[PDB]
Enzyme design. Structure first.
Site, PDB file in Angstrom:
ATOM      1  N   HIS A 288      33.030   6.280  33.936  1.00  0.00           N
ATOM      2  CA  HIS A 288      33.454   5.107  33.056  1.00  0.00           C
ATOM      3  C   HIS A 288      35.079   5.169  32.780  1.00  0.00           C
ATOM      4  CE1 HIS A 288      33.233   1.818  30.274  1.00  0.00           C
ATOM      5  NE2 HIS A 288      31.834   2.083  29.924  1.00  0.00           N
TER       6      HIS A 288
ATOM      7  N   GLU B 212      49.292  19.690  28.037  1.00  0.00           N
ATOM      8  CA  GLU B 212      49.477  18.542  27.081  1.00  0.00           C
ATOM      9  C   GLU B 212      48.824  18.893  25.780  1.00  0.00           C
ATOM     10  OE1 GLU B 212      50.745  14.714  27.347  1.00  0.00           O
ATOM     11  OE2 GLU B 212      51.284  16.553  26.360  1.00  0.00           O
TER      12      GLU B 212
ATOM     13  N   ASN C  97      50.822  17.271  22.709  1.00  0.00           N
ATOM     14  CA  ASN C  97      51.130  16.011  21.777  1.00  0.00           C
ATOM     15  C   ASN C  97      51.463  14.939  23.005  1.00  0.00           C
ATOM     16  OD1 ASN C  97      52.577  14.203  20.236  1.00  0.00           O
ATOM     17  ND2 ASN C  97      52.949  15.739  18.896  1.00  0.00           N
TER      18      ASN C  97
ATOM     19  N   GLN D 102      55.191  13.758  22.435  1.00  0.00           N
ATOM     20  CA  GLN D 102      56.390  14.489  22.228  1.00  0.00           C
ATOM     21  C   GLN D 102      56.421  15.646  23.310  1.00  0.00           C
ATOM     22  OE1 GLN D 102      56.361  15.051  17.414  1.00  0.00           O
ATOM     23  NE2 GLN D 102      56.843  16.814  18.728  1.00  0.00           N
TER      24      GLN D 102
ATOM     25  N   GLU E 273      54.023  20.974  29.848  1.00  0.00           N
ATOM     26  CA  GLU E 273      53.183  20.153  30.635  1.00  0.00           C
ATOM     27  C   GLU E 273      53.388  20.138  32.114  1.00  0.00           C
ATOM     28  OE1 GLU E 273      55.323  19.407  28.087  1.00  0.00           O
ATOM     29  OE2 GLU E 273      54.982  17.597  26.849  1.00  0.00           O
TER      30      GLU E 273
ATOM     31  N   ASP F 283      27.369   9.506  34.529  1.00  0.00           N
ATOM     32  CA  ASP F 283      28.809   9.163  33.934  1.00  0.00           C
ATOM     33  C   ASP F 283      29.414  10.452  34.253  1.00  0.00           C
ATOM     34  OD1 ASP F 283      30.251   7.898  30.880  1.00  0.00           O
ATOM     35  OD2 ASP F 283      30.941   7.964  33.077  1.00  0.00           O
TER      36      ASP F 283
ATOM     37  N   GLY G  61      38.667   7.177  23.731  1.00  0.00           N
ATOM     38  CA  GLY G  61      39.785   7.983  24.390  1.00  0.00           C
ATOM     39  C   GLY G  61      39.474   9.408  24.372  1.00  0.00           C
TER      40      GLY G  61
ATOM     41  N   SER H  18      36.386   9.901  25.515  1.00  0.00           N
ATOM     42  CA  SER H  18      35.386   9.890  26.988  1.00  0.00           C
ATOM     43  C   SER H  18      36.057  10.758  27.947  1.00  0.00           C
ATOM     44  CB  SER H  18      35.129   8.617  27.210  1.00  0.00           C
ATOM     45  OG  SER H  18      34.314   7.959  26.405  1.00  0.00           O
ATOM     46  N   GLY H  19      35.192  11.448  28.792  1.00  0.00           N
ATOM     47  CA  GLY H  19      35.737  12.322  29.956  1.00  0.00           C
ATOM     48  C   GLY H  19      36.139  13.548  29.641  1.00  0.00           C
TER      49      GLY H  19
HETATM   50  C1  LIG Z   1      34.451   7.169  25.489  1.00  0.00           C
HETATM   51  O1  LIG Z   1      35.538   7.244  24.925  1.00  0.00           O
HETATM   52  C2  LIG Z   1      33.308   6.397  25.015  1.00  0.00           C
HETATM   53  C3  LIG Z   1      32.698   7.372  23.335  1.00  0.00           C
HETATM   54  C4  LIG Z   1      32.353   8.648  23.767  1.00  0.00           C
HETATM   55  C5  LIG Z   1      33.744   6.883  22.240  1.00  0.00           C
HETATM   56  C6  LIG Z   1      33.251   4.981  25.072  1.00  0.00           C
HETATM   57  C7  LIG Z   1      34.383   4.492  25.974  1.00  0.00           C
HETATM   58  N1  LIG Z   1      34.372   2.932  25.554  1.00  0.00           N
HETATM   59  S1  LIG Z   1      35.896   2.495  25.526  1.00  0.00           S
HETATM   60  C8  LIG Z   1      36.309   1.087  24.484  1.00  0.00           C
HETATM   61  O2  LIG Z   1      37.002   3.417  24.960  1.00  0.00           O
HETATM   62  O3  LIG Z   1      36.350   2.102  27.039  1.00  0.00           O
HETATM   63  C9  LIG Z   1      33.578   4.242  27.262  1.00  0.00           C
HETATM   64  C10 LIG Z   1      32.272   4.099  26.679  1.00  0.00           C
HETATM   65  N2  LIG Z   1      32.066   4.373  25.459  1.00  0.00           N
HETATM   66  C11 LIG Z   1      30.989   3.920  24.733  1.00  0.00           C
HETATM   67  O4  LIG Z   1      30.971   4.399  23.686  1.00  0.00           O
HETATM   68  C12 LIG Z   1      29.960   3.144  25.332  1.00  0.00           C
HETATM   69  C13 LIG Z   1      28.610   2.757  24.626  1.00  0.00           C
HETATM   70  C14 LIG Z   1      28.164   1.664  25.151  1.00  0.00           C
HETATM   71  N3  LIG Z   1      26.531   1.787  24.445  1.00  0.00           N
HETATM   72  C15 LIG Z   1      25.935   0.622  25.007  1.00  0.00           C
HETATM   73  C16 LIG Z   1      24.244   0.637  24.494  1.00  0.00           C
HETATM   74  C17 LIG Z   1      23.703   1.931  25.146  1.00  0.00           C
HETATM   75  C18 LIG Z   1      24.666   3.152  24.860  1.00  0.00           C
HETATM   76  C19 LIG Z   1      25.806   2.988  25.173  1.00  0.00           C
END
Ligand SMILES: *C(=O)[C@@H](C(C)C)[C@H]1[C@H](NS(C)(=O)=O)CCN1C(=O)/C=C/CN1CCCCC1
Length: 240
Positions: A45, A59, A61, A64, A69, A93, A186, A188-189
């Site tokens: 994603h 990395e 900061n 800064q 880095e 994912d 932010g 995520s991953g």
């Molecule tokens: C990643 O940053 C995640 C969480 C860990 C915060 C977040 C990201 N969204 S965004 C706005 O930064 O692109 C990528 C997806 N995400 C989600 O929280 C997705 C949740 C979506 N639900 C839909 C219903 C079923 C469970 C997941």
């Protein structure tokens, strides 16, 4: 990371910042884990978009100069083939990024150790999530790398009705859900580092949180279970 503390700059050397080109600058969009000097493991994603990405290792900061880095472009992206952008709940994912150059290892840049295939952690196992994600639901990114203690919530509890129900699959790891600490946009991953037999290993790739917010009681942060993907990861690195 909501409810985190600033990580010491040498605590999590496999953590990377995944950034995309925006105008004449770079924007942090997700976390990732360095797994080979030229490969990074992240969430599908984070890279299923039409953008130019780079990875920053060493990395601390985002705003800064740390003086540690290494900035490297992403040469190739391999997303799990069963991934579906509009169905994160199905799982898969995960993605691997081959870097344009091999980074140099030191105390700020190390390869993350992955669990043996199939490994499942006991309930309430000690782990830390790390990242530069929002520090509050609908808040702003952190400047310094944050960490938060998020003990695991086993599949049986996590998939129960007051938790995530069937939204969580066995190919995922749940952690936290205390209402104070959690991953947030932010993050995520990035990695979920769990202590097992004295050593930390990256057991999860941050994937999703509740629609109600990041730190929501009984809605622990959900991660792709790394140990469910060891063969996939090995297969990709070997064919690329
Ligand atoms: C990643 O940053 C995640 C969480 C860990 C915060 C977040 C990201 N969204 S965004 C706005 O930064 O692109 C990528 C997806 N995400 C989600 O929280 C997705 C949740 C979506 N639900 C839909 C219903 C079923 C469970 C997941």
């Amino acid at each position: 990371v909501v409810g985190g503390t600033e990580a010491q700059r040498n605590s999590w050397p496999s953590q990377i910042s995944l950034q995309y080109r925006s105008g004449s600058s770079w924007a942090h969009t997700c976390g990732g884990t360095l797994i080979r000097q030229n490969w990074v493991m992240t969430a599908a994603h984070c890279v299923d978009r039409e953008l130019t990405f780079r990875v920053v290792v060493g990395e601390h900061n985002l705003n800064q100069n740390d003086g540690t880095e290494q900035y490297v472009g992403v040469q190739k992206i391999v997303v799990h083939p069963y991934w579906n952008t509009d169905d994160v709940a199905a799982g898969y994912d995960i993605a691997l990024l081959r870097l344009a150059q091999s980074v140099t290892l030191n105390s700020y840049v190390q390869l993350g150790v992955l669990p043996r295939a199939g490994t499942i952690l006991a309930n309430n196992s000690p782990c830390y999530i790390t990242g530069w994600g929002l520090t509050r639901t609908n808040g702003q990114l952190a400047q310094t790398l944050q960490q938060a203690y998020l003990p695991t919530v086993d599949y049986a509890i996590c998939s129960s009705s007051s938790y995530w129900g069937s939204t969580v699959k066995n190919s995922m790891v749940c952690a936290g859900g205390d209402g104070v600490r959690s991953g947030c946009q932010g993050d995520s991953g990035g990695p979920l580092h769990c202590l097992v037999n004295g050593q930390y290993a990256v057991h999860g790739v941050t994937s999703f949180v509740s629609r109600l917010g990041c730190n929501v009681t009984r809605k622990p942060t959900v991660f792709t279970r790394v140990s469910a993907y060891i063969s996939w990861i090995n297969n990709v690195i070997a064919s690329n």
